Amino acid sequence: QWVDCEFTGRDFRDEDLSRLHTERAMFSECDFSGVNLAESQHRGSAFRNCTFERTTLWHSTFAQCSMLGSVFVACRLRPLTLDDVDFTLAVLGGNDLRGLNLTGCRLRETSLVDTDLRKCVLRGADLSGARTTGARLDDADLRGATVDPVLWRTASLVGARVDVDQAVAFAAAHGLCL
Amino acid sequence: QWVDCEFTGRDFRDEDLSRLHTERAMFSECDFSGVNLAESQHRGSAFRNCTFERTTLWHSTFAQCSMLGSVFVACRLRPLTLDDVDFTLAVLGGNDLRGLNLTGCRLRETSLVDTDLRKCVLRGADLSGARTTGARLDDADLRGATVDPVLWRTASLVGARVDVDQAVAFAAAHGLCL
Ligand SMILES: [Cs+]
Ligand SMILES: [Cs+]
Ligand SMILES: [Cs+]
Ligand SMILES: [Cs+]
Ligand SMILES: [Cs+]
Numbered sequence: 251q252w253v254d255c256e257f258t259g260r261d262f263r264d265e266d267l268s269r270l271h272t273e274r275a276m277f278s279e280c281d282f283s284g285v286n287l288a289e290s291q292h293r294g295s296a297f298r299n300c301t302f303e304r305t306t307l308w309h310s311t312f313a314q315c316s317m318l319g320s321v322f323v324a325c326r327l328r329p330l331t332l333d334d335v336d337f338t339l340a341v342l343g344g345n346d347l348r349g350l351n352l353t354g355c356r357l358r359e360t361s362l363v364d365t366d367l368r369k370c371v372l373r374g375a376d377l378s379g380a381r382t383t384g385a386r387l388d389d390a391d392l393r394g395a396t397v398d399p400v401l402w403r404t405a406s407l408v409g410a411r412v413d414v415d416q417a418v419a420f421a422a423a424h425g426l427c428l
Numbered sequence: 429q430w431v432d433c434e435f436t437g438r439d440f441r442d443e444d445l446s447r448l449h450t451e452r453a454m455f456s457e458c459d460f461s462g463v464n465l466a467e468s469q470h471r472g473s474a475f476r477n478c479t480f481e482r483t484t485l486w487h488s489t490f491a492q493c494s495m496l497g498s499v500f501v502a503c504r505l506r507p508l509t510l511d512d513v514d515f516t517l518a519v520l521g522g523n524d525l526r527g528l529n530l531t532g533c534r535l536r537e538t539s540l541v542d543t544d545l546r547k548c549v550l551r552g553a554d555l556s557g558a559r560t561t562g563a564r565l566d567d568a569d570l571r572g573a574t575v576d577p578v579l580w581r582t583a584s585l586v587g588a589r590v591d592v593d594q595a596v597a598f599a600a601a602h603g604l605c606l
């Protein structure tokens with residue numbers, strides 16, 4: 251258990267940190283490449299501008315945690331239990347996030363380039379400023395999520411679930427004039 | 429002036445009928461191929477299942493007239509003054525109708541295949557059952573018009589003006605789930 255402490259510029263590479271429990275641990279610029287972090291549990295922690303390359307995070311829990319600015323490259327992120335996790339400014343490009351429940355999660359200015367979010371639950375999520383080029387949102391649930399008009403012409407949306415507002419914004423994003 | 433009379437299966441081909449005035453003239457199955465009908469004026473008349481091939485109808489006026497079932501092939505239809513003209517079941521495929529004001533006109537089960545309706549005013553029009561394959565509705569005004577979901581994936585709509593309902597139906601026609 252790492253409780254009420256910080257870690258800055260620490261190199262945790264290729265370590266086995268499975269089942270780690272943290273509470274109010276603030277990590278800044280820590281390197282978690284090749285780290286095995288399966289079955290870990292986090293509550294109130296922050297992983298700020300950290301590097302997650304090929305990090306294994308599946309079967310984990312993050313509650314009220316921040317991931318602001320962190321970069322995730324080819325990470326195993328499913329399944330995963332998230333409750334109010336801030337992904338603002340984070341880089342999730344190219345990862346497979348299919349099926350993850352991301353209700354009300356902040357993804358402001360998050361990079362979602364070529365990220366697979368198929369069937370993801372994004373109700374009430376905030377995607378203001380996210381980069382969605384090549385993003386796959388098929389069969390995902392977006393109702394009440396705040397999204398920019400650019401998303402409507404960048405992500406694939408077959409079967410995506412939306413509210414009236416989004417449908418209207420989709421329509422205007424494809425050249426119709428309201 | 430042809431007033432309160434009928435004409436059935438009449439052959440009017442290649443006749444000069446320019447400036448003709450009719451009032452409650454009922455034409456059924458009349459052939460108007462190659463006919464010049466420019467500057468004509470019609471009020472309360474019917475042109476039912478008539479044939480209009482290469483007929484010249486520009487600079488004309490039709491008020492409360494019916495065109496039910498008539499076939500129009502390469503006709504000059506612009507400009508034109510229409511007020512409540514019924515085009516139900518009519519064949520307007522391939523004609524250039526650009527810019528025509530068609531407010532509240534019925535186009536139920538009308539064939540609009542490859543018809544150019546760019547910039548047309550179709551407010552309050554009824555297009556239930558129209559066939560819109562290759563139809564061009566760019567910069568046209570559709571607000572309050574009743575249209576089938578199939579129109580949203582068949583006609584070109586760049587800049588078309590729509591209300592909230594149509595935008596929503598456009599959205600659902602492209603795979604989004606409301
Ligand atoms: Cs361990
Ligand atoms: Cs802090
Ligand atoms: Cs949860
Ligand atoms: Cs969640
Ligand atoms: Cs916003």
Ligand SMILES: [Cs+]
Nearest residue numbers: 358359378379
């Ligand atoms: Cs911003």
Ligand SMILES: [Cs+]
Nearest residue numbers: 444445446447
């Ligand atoms: Cs004449």
Ligand SMILES: [Cs+]
Nearest residue numbers: 434453454474
């Ligand atoms: Cs009649």
Ligand SMILES: [Cs+]
Nearest residue numbers: 509510511529
């Ligand atoms: Cs008129």
Ligand SMILES: [Cs+]
Nearest residue numbers: 510529530531
């Ligand atoms: Cs009109």
Ligand SMILES: [Cs+]
Nearest residue numbers: 556557574575
């Ligand atoms: Cs209808």
Ligand SMILES: [Cs+]
Nearest residue numbers: 536537556557
């Ligand atoms: Cs019908």
